[PDB]
Write an enzyme that holds these catalytic residues in place. Structure first.
Site: not given
Ligand code: HEM
Ligand SMILES: CN(C)Cc1cccc(NCc2ccc3ccc(N)nc3c2)c1
Ligand code: HEM
Ligand SMILES: CN(C)Cc1cccc(NCc2ccc3ccc(N)nc3c2)c1
Ligand SMILES: C[C@H](O)[C@H](O)[C@H]1CNc2nc(N)[nH]c(=O)c2N1
Ligand SMILES: C[C@H](O)[C@H](O)[C@H]1CNc2nc(N)[nH]c(=O)c2N1
Ligand SMILES: [Zn+2]
Lengths: 408, 413
Positions: B111, B114, B283, B288
């Site tokens: 992420c 963070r 958000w 994305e």
């Molecule tokens: C608040 C603004 C946030 C932004 C801008 C953001 C941004 C991102 C982005 C760009 C990714 C990669 C997404 C993708 O390519 O699918 C990601 C992954 C992830 N985010 Fe964040 N995120 C946010 C909030 C959060 C929150 C609130 C959580 C959990 C409480 C979180 C947990 C995760 C996790 C666990 C992943 C890995 C997902 C996976 O392995 O499939 N994020 N985030």
């Molecule tokens: C596969 N699952 C983890 C659900 C899923 C479906 C489609 C896309 C993604 N991306 C991972 C992911 C996880 C958390 C996020 C939080 C915020 C954000 N902007 N993108 C986030 C993206 C995740």
């Protein structure tokens, strides 16, 4: 165990067996991945390595366990015994050099691996000799714009006090100069090396694109300066097919990428001087060389001329400017009939290469961090391709810059 | 394992020193001879398995509030231990649940967002017993997180796993997504990513409008029961029509997207406890939507149509028509969200904030696990600062984990 890699776009699954042959270490552990870290003999150590290599060579020409194979092992053992090293056969030198390329997990150009012209320079004894071999390499590889992949191999390490080294990081590079006002003229990446050439006697023109001299070390001696004959240095003026002002930026680049600071390891033997060359992927120049903050750093200027709004990042003015520069580079090389490949064509060829290698070899070690291009990543097929990275030998390895180990 | 691992930034020369990796709990998939860094995804806990996992977490929490070794620490340890002994599980206190959720986010290597980890609204839904109740909780979550466009990060946590036959699950991969429909002729209408799930919904009784942007219904499983369908009230679904500040024709493409990314198929692990339903939202980073959702070939795949409207030569790849179109689409996405005052972050701002976050984390925490393959944005990689930043990836707990899709494991009643 067999490992599977999936392409998440095509859903193609490949099965890797080849990784089971690796013996060198990657840097990672079971608990910590170091995938994005840039850089993580004796007679007794030497023979098993020699043996490992002779075995795969004779396995490769399908005469494993032949009288030829048995005799070669014997000859090598005796030679290591009596001299603390050994010399490769010409056939072995060529095989090993091609396979170091084939095994280079970071190289997206490996579909070409078996088309490599190998120049044996192991009889070289002086910096003048090295210069001669290098000129011949540059002339052959450049080939009037029709670039041909090549490697020139200088004598292997003996005691470490008599290394052959090319001090340049590439055979052809542009100087970088530290300015009184603290800025940098030329290429900022080469500032240090440029200073060393100056200290060694090089008289710098102090331009933006001054081709550096060769600084060549033979048999552990002090390095010596040579000017590559200019007719051997092919360059491309960068212009844009739509923006007639782009040429006014005064940009150019050299056609031949020739990495000269790596170490080639074959059968336990170490070749500290092995300049090799292929041809450019456009982004290498258009994205990194031109647009890295610590390189030529031209985004601002181009963005200005494009009359973009540079007040906020979210206008993506950097991204726009980046694409146009890369269009210009490809257009310029193509218009001058100089070999270059775009990142779409290159990555596509790499995927096909991977499929080839899985089929005939059981795998292909690949470093996603390096394979994926530095722009438009996910619109190239490699972004969606799972890769397994492992270290196979023969290999190309990093080595320390010679000005940190050399005594004068 | 060596005590100090160094990471370097190759453009700033800044070197950072990681010690936090010593706290790594699980395996990455890599070994000393192979790296699986680009691999996407490389029966309940027994009493004896649960004891040290709970103690590890309780110790960590009390250390975080500077009450380590205190009477309250020792008492909590003893009470947890008793509960595990007489019930084979335990219940987290509200404070511990909140700390755990924030830290799962803080620990999510992939992420880039963070820097925000400590501002997470945690909704405790462990009292929930039915799918209608899950629906109520999810509706409230959506409304709060959306906040009329001023999005607020949040998580809603449903009851933990007990025996594994009574799992709460949100069957949707995200709370809000568009349907995909395979046509008899092989073409796809809507979002091809969601075809399988859409088919499942239709079988469960959902009447599909069969459009290009149909918000999917919630498919909600409570207490291991068969999942149930609910329609999200449309006034709760904030959407942004995509237009371009220069290209007036861009709006005629009829694209839009939803404002709230709310991932709902992950598992939250805290102190050995497993929360199989824990939908969370933040958000969007513009890429994305503008790179992946729109320009992935297996998604909406609009590059060609945009390129044609842009009057580009699409005969040679080396004209970079794809790259040129891709940038314009991402400009349109950021412009449209900003114009409608819906929170969004561009990839430059996000990655620069992440570098600052990572540096702060190295200094106050001794490290920041990061997955470079995921952290580097899907366009313009090397002109963002994360490209040049060495990272170390390792798994800390509490953590968010992948779990199998529930239709593959569900025992139908
Ligand atoms: C608040 C603004 C946030 C932004 C801008 C953001 C941004 C991102 C982005 C760009 C990714 C990669 C997404 C993708 O390519 O699918 C990601 C992954 C992830 N985010 Fe964040 N995120 C946010 C909030 C959060 C929150 C609130 C959580 C959990 C409480 C979180 C947990 C995760 C996790 C666990 C992943 C890995 C997902 C996976 O392995 O499939 N994020 N985030
Ligand atoms: C596969 N699952 C983890 C659900 C899923 C479906 C489609 C896309 C993604 N991306 C991972 C992911 C996880 C958390 C996020 C939080 C915020 C954000 N902007 N993108 C986030 C993206 C995740
Ligand atoms: C023929 C055309 C070739 C193309 C288009 C090509 C392309 C590339 C590119 C784009 C990179 C990444 C470089 C960077 O980002 O700095 C790379 C890396 C590499 N290439 Fe190739 N290459 C070619 C030929 C060769 C040849 C002939 C050799 C050796 C015989 C070779 C060996 C390597 C090695 C060892 C690396 C990794 C270097 C490192 O780890 O620092 N390549 N290649
Ligand atoms: C720092 N040294 C390893 C030399 C150096 C300087 C600048 C860039 C690189 N990249 C490695 C590298 C290696 C082989 C290549 C072959 C062809 C090509 N087009 N680029 C290639 C790039 C290598
Ligand atoms: C094969 C590879 O691991 C896969 O395409 C990954 C690459 N990096 C990614 N990075 C992000 N942020 N999101 C993704 O879906 C992916 N996909
Ligand atoms: C930190 C990271 O390892 C470093 O910046 C790498 C990233 N990927 C790269 N990929 C290529 N092809 N070339 C590079 O120099 C780099 N640099
Ligand atoms: Zn690894």
């Amino acid at each position: 165990r067999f490992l599977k890699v999936k392409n998440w776009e095509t859903e193609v699954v490949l099965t890797d067996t080849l990784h089971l042959k690796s013996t060198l270490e990657t840097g990672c552990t079971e608990y910590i991945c170091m995938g994005s870290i840039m850089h993580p003999a004796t007679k007794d150590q030497l023979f098993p390595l020699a043996k490992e290599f002779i075995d795969q060579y004779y396995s490769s020409i399908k005469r494993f366990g032949s009288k030829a194979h048995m005799e070669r092992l014997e000859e090598v053992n005796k030679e290591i015994d009596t001299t603390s090293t050994y010399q490769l056969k010409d056939t072995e030198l060529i095989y090993g050099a091609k396979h170091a390329w084939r095994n280079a997990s970071r190289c997206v150009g490996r579909i070409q691996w078996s088309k490599l012209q190998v120049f044996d320079a192991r009889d070289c004894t002086t910096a003048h000799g090295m210069f001669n071999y290098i000129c011949n390499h540059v002339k052959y590889a450049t080939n009037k714009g029709n670039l041909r992949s090549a490697i020139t191999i200088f004598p292997q390490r003996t005691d470490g006090k008599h290394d052959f080294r090319v001090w340049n990081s590439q055979l052809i590079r542009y100087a970088g100069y530290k300015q009184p006002d603290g800025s940098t003229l030329g290429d900022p990446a080469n500032v240090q090396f440029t200073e060393i050439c100056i200290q060694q006697g090089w008289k710098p023109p102090r331009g933006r694109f001054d081709v550096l001299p060769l600084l060549l070390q033979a048999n552990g001696n002090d390095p010596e300066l040579f000017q590559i004959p200019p007719e051997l240095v092919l360059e491309v003026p960068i212009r844009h097919p739509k923006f007639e002002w782009f040429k006014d930026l005064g940009l150019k680049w050299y056609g031949l990428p020739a990495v000269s600071n790596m170490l080639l390891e074959i059968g336990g033997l170490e070749f500290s001087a092995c300049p090799f060359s292929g041809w450019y992927m456009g982004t290498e120049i258009g994205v990194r060389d031109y647009c890295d903050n610590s390189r030529y750093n031209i985004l601002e200027e181009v963005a200005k001329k494009m009359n973009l709004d540079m007040r906020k990042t979210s206008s993506l003015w950097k991204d726009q400017a980046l694409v146009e520069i890369n269009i210009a580079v490809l257009y310029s090389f193509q218009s001058d009939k100089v070999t270059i490949v775009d990142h779409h064509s290159a990555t596509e060829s790499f995927i096909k290469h991977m499929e080839n290698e899985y089929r005939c070899r059981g795998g292909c070690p690949a470093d996603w961090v390096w394979i994926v291009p530095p722009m438009s990543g996910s619109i190239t097929p490699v972004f969606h391709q799972e890769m397994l990275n492992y270290r196979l030998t023969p290999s190309f390895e990093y080595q320390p810059d010679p000005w940190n180990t050399h005594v004068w």
